[PDB]
C-alpha cells in the first residue's frame with residue numbers, strides 16, 4: 001500500500017489531516033481525520049482561519065439536498081447545508097465516489113488557527129451522524145461504491161518535539177491506509193479488541209496500571225459512560241473518578257519533582273533545560289482491553305513521551321516544554337491522538353474489531369518502549385461495559 005504511506009500531516013494538538021478533492025473540477029482540501037464523529041463536512045464560506053473552501057457554485061456535479069444540519073460539541077460547533085458531490089483521495093485508493101458533504105456556513109471554535117485543514121472526515125458509524133443515521137457516512141459510501149475492503153488503519157506520528165508552521169507543513173505526519181494493513185508501520189504483533197457497538201469506535205477497558213500498580217477500581221468506572229478510540233481528540237480523556245485516581249497515582253510516582261496544579265489541569269506547561277526532561281521519573285500507563293478469545297485480555301502501554309505533549313516555549317528559548325495531555329472527561333474514556341501516537345491502529349470494520357500494535361514511529365527513550373502485550377486471563381470482562 002505504498003501509495004498511501006506518508007499521506008498524513010499534522011500533530012496531536014491541531015489534529016492529523018489527509019488531502020482530498022471535492023467537486024468537478026476537483027477542489028483540493030485538507031481534511032481532519034476523525035474516528036470520533038461521522039460527518040464529512042467542509043468549510044464552504046470565507047473564515048478568518050481558512051485559506052481555501054468548498055465552492056459549490058463551481059462544481060458541476062454538486063447536488064443540493066435542500067436540508068440544514070447542526071453539529072454541536074462541548075468544545076465547539078458548526079452548522080451547514082447538506083448536499084452530495086464526487087470525492088477522491090489523491091494519496092488513497094484510486095477511486096472517485098459520490099458522498100454526502102455538509103457545506104459549513106457558520107462555526108464557533110471549530111476551525112483552528114494555523115492547523116491547515118479545511119474540513120473534517122468523520123470515520124465513525126451512521127448512528128451518530130447528524131441530523132440522523134440516514135445520512136450515509138463517507139466510508140460507508142466508499143465501501144458500497146467500490147471494491148475497497150471494509151477496513152482502514154492509522155499511524156499518527158508525533159514528532160516528540162515542537163514543530164513550527166513551516167515544519168508541520170513540510171513533515172510527514174503519518175499514514176492512513178484505506179482498505180488494508182501496511183506491515184512497515186508497526187513492530188511485534190497486532191492484538192484485537194472487539195468493537196462493542198457500531199456507533200463511536202467503542203471498546204472495553206478491563207484494567208488500568210500506573211507503573212504496574214493496579215488502580216484497583218471497579219471495571220465499570222473505566223468505561224463510564226463509554227470508551228472510544230478518537231482520532232480528532234488531542235488528549236487521553238478519563239472519567240471524573242478515574243482521572244482523579246490516575247492523577248493521584250502519577251503524582252506519587254513522580255513525587256521527586258513537584259509541579260504547579262495548573263500543570264495537572266492540562267493548562268500550564270512545564271519546561272526543562274534542553275535535553276534534560278526527566279522521563280524516567282514519570283510512570284508508564286497500561287490499559288488492558290478485552291480480547292477476542294473468551295476470558296482473555298491484552299494491554300497497551302504508553303510512555304510519558306505519549307502523555308506529555310510537546311509545546312514550544314512561551315519565549316521560544318532552548319527549553320523542552322510540555323503540556324500534561326490527560327484531562328477530566330464528563331463523557332467517558334477518550335483514547336485520543338496522544339494515545340494513538342504510540343500505536344498502529346487497525347479499524348477492522350469488516351470483522352468488528354480494533355487492532356493495536358507498537359508503532360514504528362512512536363516516541364521513546366533508550367530505556368523504555370511502548371508496548372502491546374498479552375494474553376492475560378481476565379474474568380467477567382463483559383460487565384465492565386456500561387448500560
Ligand SMILES: COc1ccc(-c2nsc(C)c2C(=O)NC(=N)NCc2cc(Cl)c(N)c(Cl)c2)cc1
Nearest residue numbers: 034036037073074075076077109110230232233331
Ligand atoms: C477540546 O476539548 C474536548 C472536549 C470533549 C470531547 C469528546 N468527548 S467524547 C467524543 C466522541 C468527543 C469528540 O468530539 N471527538 C471528536 N473528533 N469530536 C469532533 C471535533 C473535532 C474538532 Cl478539531 C473541533 N474543534 C470540535 Cl468542536 C469537534 C473532545 C475534546
